[PDB]
Structure formats: structure tokens, C-alpha cells
Enzyme design. Structure first.
Site, PDB file in Angstrom:
ATOM      1  N   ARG A 150      -4.894  19.270 -12.290  1.00 35.74           N
ATOM      2  CA  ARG A 150      -4.603  17.899 -12.691  1.00 35.74           C
ATOM      3  C   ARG A 150      -5.645  16.993 -12.059  1.00 35.74           C
ATOM      4  NH1 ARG A 150      -1.348  14.256 -10.905  1.00 35.74           N
ATOM      5  NH2 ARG A 150      -0.219  12.727 -12.142  1.00 35.74           N
TER       6      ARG A 150
ATOM      7  N   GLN B 238      -0.115  10.197  -4.115  1.00 36.62           N
ATOM      8  CA  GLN B 238      -1.392   9.771  -3.539  1.00 36.62           C
ATOM      9  C   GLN B 238      -1.200   8.514  -2.710  1.00 36.62           C
ATOM     10  OE1 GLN B 238      -5.240  11.313  -3.338  1.00 36.62           O
ATOM     11  NE2 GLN B 238      -4.343  11.531  -5.403  1.00 36.62           N
TER      12      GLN B 238
ATOM     13  N   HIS C 134      -2.670   6.445 -14.680  1.00 37.74           N
ATOM     14  CA  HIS C 134      -1.503   5.863 -15.314  1.00 37.74           C
ATOM     15  C   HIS C 134      -1.838   4.693 -16.218  1.00 37.74           C
ATOM     16  CE1 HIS C 134       0.065   7.427 -11.295  1.00 37.74           C
ATOM     17  NE2 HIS C 134       0.373   8.327 -12.213  1.00 37.74           N
TER      18      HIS C 134
ATOM     19  N   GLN D 223       3.146  10.633 -18.230  1.00 34.65           N
ATOM     20  CA  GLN D 223       2.961  10.094 -16.888  1.00 34.65           C
ATOM     21  C   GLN D 223       1.498   9.770 -16.698  1.00 34.65           C
ATOM     22  OE1 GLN D 223       2.780  12.571 -13.216  1.00 34.65           O
ATOM     23  NE2 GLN D 223       4.707  11.542 -12.694  1.00 34.65           N
TER      24      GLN D 223
ATOM     25  N   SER E  45       4.546   9.411  -8.959  1.00 31.98           N
ATOM     26  CA  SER E  45       3.310   9.982  -9.445  1.00 31.98           C
ATOM     27  C   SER E  45       3.331  11.475  -9.134  1.00 31.98           C
ATOM     28  CB  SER E  45       2.140   9.266  -8.781  1.00 31.98           C
ATOM     29  OG  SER E  45       0.890   9.699  -9.287  1.00 31.98           O
ATOM     30  N   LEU E  46       2.490  11.936  -8.212  1.00 34.00           N
ATOM     31  CA  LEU E  46       2.329  13.357  -8.018  1.00 34.00           C
ATOM     32  C   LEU E  46       3.687  13.896  -7.540  1.00 34.00           C
ATOM     33  CD1 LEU E  46       2.109  15.312  -5.451  1.00 34.00           C
ATOM     34  CD2 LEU E  46       0.820  16.088  -7.436  1.00 34.00           C
TER      35      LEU E  46
HETATM   36  C1  COZ Z   1       0.294  -1.027  -0.008  1.00 35.07           C
HETATM   37  C2  COZ Z   1       1.435  -0.498   0.871  1.00 35.07           C
HETATM   38  C3  COZ Z   1       0.829   0.236   2.071  1.00 35.07           C
HETATM   39  C4  COZ Z   1       2.215  -1.711   1.391  1.00 35.07           C
HETATM   40  O1  COZ Z   1       3.342  -1.299   2.153  1.00 35.07           O
HETATM   41  P1  COZ Z   1       3.634  -1.980   3.626  1.00 35.07           P
HETATM   42  O2  COZ Z   1       2.360  -2.048   4.389  1.00 35.07           O
HETATM   43  O3  COZ Z   1       4.714  -1.220   4.305  1.00 35.07           O
HETATM   44  O4  COZ Z   1       4.170  -3.528   3.308  1.00 35.07           O
HETATM   45  P2  COZ Z   1       4.407  -4.590   4.575  1.00 35.07           P
HETATM   46  O5  COZ Z   1       3.090  -4.911   5.193  1.00 35.07           O
HETATM   47  O6  COZ Z   1       5.401  -4.015   5.517  1.00 35.07           O
HETATM   48  O7  COZ Z   1       5.043  -5.954   3.894  1.00 35.07           O
HETATM   49  C5  COZ Z   1       4.636  -7.250   4.320  1.00 35.07           C
HETATM   50  C6  COZ Z   1       3.294  -7.640   3.675  1.00 35.07           C
HETATM   51  O8  COZ Z   1       3.189  -7.066   2.375  1.00 35.07           O
HETATM   52  C7  COZ Z   1       3.532  -8.056   1.398  1.00 35.07           C
HETATM   53  N1  COZ Z   1       4.543  -7.526   0.471  1.00 35.07           N
HETATM   54  C8  COZ Z   1       4.843  -6.177   0.405  1.00 35.07           C
HETATM   55  N2  COZ Z   1       5.790  -5.985  -0.616  1.00 35.07           N
HETATM   56  C9  COZ Z   1       6.047  -7.274  -1.174  1.00 35.07           C
HETATM   57  C10 COZ Z   1       6.902  -7.600  -2.224  1.00 35.07           C
HETATM   58  N3  COZ Z   1       7.648  -6.661  -2.986  1.00 35.07           N
HETATM   59  N4  COZ Z   1       7.001  -8.981  -2.546  1.00 35.07           N
HETATM   60  C11 COZ Z   1       6.284  -9.969  -1.915  1.00 35.07           C
HETATM   61  N5  COZ Z   1       5.378  -9.616  -0.871  1.00 35.07           N
HETATM   62  C12 COZ Z   1       5.291  -8.193  -0.503  1.00 35.07           C
HETATM   63  C13 COZ Z   1       3.955  -9.354   2.105  1.00 35.07           C
HETATM   64  O9  COZ Z   1       5.365  -9.417   2.331  1.00 35.07           O
HETATM   65  C14 COZ Z   1       3.215  -9.143   3.414  1.00 35.07           C
HETATM   66  O10 COZ Z   1       3.720  -9.932   4.480  1.00 35.07           O
HETATM   67  P3  COZ Z   1       2.658 -10.446   5.628  1.00 35.07           P
HETATM   68  O11 COZ Z   1       1.552 -11.228   4.869  1.00 35.07           O
HETATM   69  O12 COZ Z   1       3.487 -11.356   6.590  1.00 35.07           O
HETATM   70  O13 COZ Z   1       2.126  -9.164   6.326  1.00 35.07           O
HETATM   71  C15 COZ Z   1       2.385   0.435   0.081  1.00 35.07           C
HETATM   72  O14 COZ Z   1       3.165  -0.296  -0.862  1.00 35.07           O
HETATM   73  C16 COZ Z   1       1.666   1.550  -0.622  1.00 35.07           C
HETATM   74  O15 COZ Z   1       1.235   2.553  -0.057  1.00 35.07           O
HETATM   75  N6  COZ Z   1       1.492   1.393  -1.987  1.00 35.07           N
HETATM   76  C17 COZ Z   1       0.715   2.361  -2.769  1.00 35.07           C
HETATM   77  C18 COZ Z   1       1.464   2.763  -4.037  1.00 35.07           C
HETATM   78  C19 COZ Z   1       0.539   3.534  -4.921  1.00 35.07           C
HETATM   79  O16 COZ Z   1       0.256   3.172  -6.062  1.00 35.07           O
HETATM   80  N7  COZ Z   1      -0.028   4.683  -4.390  1.00 35.07           N
HETATM   81  C20 COZ Z   1      -1.051   5.440  -5.134  1.00 35.07           C
HETATM   82  C21 COZ Z   1      -2.271   5.706  -4.249  1.00 35.07           C
HETATM   83  S1  COZ Z   1      -2.982   4.152  -3.641  1.00 35.07           S
END
Ligand code: COZ
Length: 307
Positions: free
Chosen positions: A115, A9, A199, A248, A90-91
Site C-alpha cells: 500500500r 501515520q 485520502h 479509503q 487510516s492505516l
Molecule cells: C496535530 C496533532 C498532534 C494535534 O494534537 P495535540 O497536540 O494533542 O493538540 P493540543 O496541542 O493538545 O491542543 C491545543 C492546541 O491545538 C489546537 N486545537 C487542537 N484541536 C482543536 C480543535 N478540535 N478545535 C479548536 N482548536 C484545536 C488549539 O486548541 C491549541 O491550543 P494552544 O494554541 O493554546 O496550544 C494531532 O491531532 C495529530 O497527530 N493529528 C494528525 C492526524 C492525521 O491526519 N495523521 C496522519 C499523519 S500526519
């Protein structure tokens, strides 16, 4: 050397795989096969949306499963070699399991739709919440979560990388908790636009239910090792796989340790077999020697296949 890794997701888009579809008939044959099992046009769903709809979890899960299985089918079609290791977020774990040949594709398809449903119906919308905590260590989050709980339910659910953790539970507690985490030195609590607190404890009852359905699906032996979200263990007993699917549902997804395990495991590269770049994005945050790329466009499909 390489592993395949499988999103879930969040990775959906209206439009996804369009390009691949144009260069590889089997993408659509594939959505056709699943469409015939859901009793609606799933390709049309993904291509036209709307989003509102494509984002409802009992359709998202089937759509993503389908994309992934489709992209995998392309790999093999083109004499892609089988990866050393798979994991699925996850999925994703379901897609992994299909491509590993443990669950048949059409069982999987109905499965992940059921699910979806169990999930959606275990919490009433606007009841729960997920948030992404950018930039705190795991334990300050546990702690944050514990003090914010205040009788309700919130906890970390997605260990995506170091300084990315997702939490979830009752909408309010998530609120308390994000704040807490900010208190405690976090860059960001960014509220996530999802109904469903996957989760954490609140999915228990869904999963009870999920066990019943699983118990009807034949689970075969993996042809490739699949590192599971819940134990970071590579099970072979379908009964043990089944048991891990079930948990999970209400337990944190151990992504970080899972990518680690597979580095620890030998793997030098990870291909994201499904739409989007999310697992790709995370990889180097977990082990920065590791490299990552998506196999969801043709140049890239072609490019990977040549090696
Ligand atoms: C939320 C998302 C979109 C973030 O990924 P990206 O947008 O590629 O991250 P980026 O924007 O490239 O990374 C930089 C930014 O994120 C932050 N960041 C991302 N990972 C970080 C980490 N591990 N440690 C510290 N900061 C982090 C900051 O570095 C920030 O920098 P800026 O303020 O200068 O923009 C991604 O992790 C995601 O889709 N997560 C969902 C996971 C999940 O549970 N999915 C289920 C459905 S929601």
C-alpha cells in the site's frame, strides 16, 4: 462499553513499545513474524530508526500495524475481554481488521507495505502536501478548498474532530487553501511534514492498484464490528470490506462521525491500542463525556486489565 481504536501515520516513534517489549515477550515474537514477511528486521527498524526511514510510509504502515497487533495480542494473552467495537484511523483500519480476525496478520503486513508503495508512487515527493486546519467548521473548509483549487487538487481528508480537519492535494493548492482557511477564521493552518496526500483524489490510481492486491487476500467475517473510515458503516462482506479499503484510499477519513457513531452506539470508553496518544487526544473533542486512554505502556496495560 469499550471500543479499541487504532492509530496510523503520525504515531510512529523510534523507540515505540520498548517498555511493553520488556514486560511482554510477545511484542517481539510479533515483530519477528512480520520481519520474516517483509524480509527485514522491523523491530530493529522501529527501535533504532532512523526516523527518516521509519517515517517512509511503506515501512511506517507495517511498523504501526505490527505495534498494534502486538499490543492486542498482549490484551488477549492476559485475558483481556474483547471490545464491543473497533475503529482504526487510516492505516489503523487495517489493524482493526487483523485483530477482528478478518485479514490474517502476515497478509496484512505485506499488504500495507505494498500500500505504502502504491501510495508513494502515485505522487512524486514535493508534489503534494497535507495541512492541519485548527479551528474552522467543516463547510468553511470545503469552501476554502473549493476556491483554492484553481484546477489542481485539494480537499479535506481527515475529519479528526470539530476544529481539527486535515486537507491535502497538490502542494500549491494546499497552500492556497490553508491561507483561505485562515482568511475565514481559522486559528491555525499548520503544515504537516508528510510526503503523501492520503485520502484525496490523487490516490485514485494507487487504489486501483490496491484493489488488485486485496483481491488476492482472503477476507473473513469480522468477529467484532469494525466501523470503517469511509462510510462509517460496519460491513461484514469481505468483498464490501475490501471495497471500503479501496475507497479509503481516495476519500476523506470520517473519524469524527466514527467516534460519534460508537458513542451513539453505546460505547463509554476508547482504548488506543498502538503507540502514541493521538486518538486519545481527540476523543473528548468529539464527545466529551467519552473517555480515552492508550494501551501502549505496561502500568496502563495492567491498569486497564484489572477492571
Ligand atoms: C496535530 C496533532 C498532534 C494535534 O494534537 P495535540 O497536540 O494533542 O493538540 P493540543 O496541542 O493538545 O491542543 C491545543 C492546541 O491545538 C489546537 N486545537 C487542537 N484541536 C482543536 C480543535 N478540535 N478545535 C479548536 N482548536 C484545536 C488549539 O486548541 C491549541 O491550543 P494552544 O494554541 O493554546 O496550544 C494531532 O491531532 C495529530 O497527530 N493529528 C494528525 C492526524 C492525521 O491526519 N495523521 C496522519 C499523519 S500526519
Amino acid at each position: 462499553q469499550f471500543a479499541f481504536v487504532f492509530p496510523g501515520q503520525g504515531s510512529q516513534t523510534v523507540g515505540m513499545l520498548a517498555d511493553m517489549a520488556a514486560s511482554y515477550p510477545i511484542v517481539e515474537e510479533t515483530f519477528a513474524e512480520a520481519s520474516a514477511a517483509l524480509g527485514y528486521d522491523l523491530w530493529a527498524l522501529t527501535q533504532q530508526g532512523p526516523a527518516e526511514e521509519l517515517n517512509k510510509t511503506w515501512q511506517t504502515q507495517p511498523a504501526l500495524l505490527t505495534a498494534s497487533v502486538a499490543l492486542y495480542r498482549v490484551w488477549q494473552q492476559q485475558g483481556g475481554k474483547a471490545p464491543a467495537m473497533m475503529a482504526g484511523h487510516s492505516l489503523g483500519e487495517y489493524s482493526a481488521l487483523v485483530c477482528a480476525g478478518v485479514i490474517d496478520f502476515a497478509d496484512a503486513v505485506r499488504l500495507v507495505e505494498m500500500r505504502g508503495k502504491f501510495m508513494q508512487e502515485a505522487v512524486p515527493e514535493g508534489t503534494g502536501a497535507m495541512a492541519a486546519i485548527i479551528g474552522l467548521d467543516d463547510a468553511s473548509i470545503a469552501k476554502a478548498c473549493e476556491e483554492a483549487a484553481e484546477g489542481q487538487v485539494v480537499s479535506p481528508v481527515n475529519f479528526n474532530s470539530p476544529g481539527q480537519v486535515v486537507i491535502a492535494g497538490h502542494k500549491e493548492a494546499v497552500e492556497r487553501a490553508g491561507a483561505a482557511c485562515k482568511a475565514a477564521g481559522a486559528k491555525r493552518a499548520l503544515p504537516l511534514p508528510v510526503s503523501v496526500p492520503s485520502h484525496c483524489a490523487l490516490m485514485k490510481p494507487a487504489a486501483d492498484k490496491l484493489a488488485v492486491e486485496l483481491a488476492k487476500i482472503t477476507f473473513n467475517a469480522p468477529t467484532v464490528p469494525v466501523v470503517n473510515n469511509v462510510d462509517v458503516k460496519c460491513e461484514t462482506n469481505g468483498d464490501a470490506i475490501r471495497d471500503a479499503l479501496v475507497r479509503q484510499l481516495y476519500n476523506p477519513v470520517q473519524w469524527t462521525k466514527s467516534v460519534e457513531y460508537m458513542a451513539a452506539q453505546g460505547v463509554e470508553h476508547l482504548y488506543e491500542v498502538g503507540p502514541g496518544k493521538v486518538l486519545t487526544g481527540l476523543t473528548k473533542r468529539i464527545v466529551d463525556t467519552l473517555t480515552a486512554s492508550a494501551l501502549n505502556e505496561p502500568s496502563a496495560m495492567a491498569a486497564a486489565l484489572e477492571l
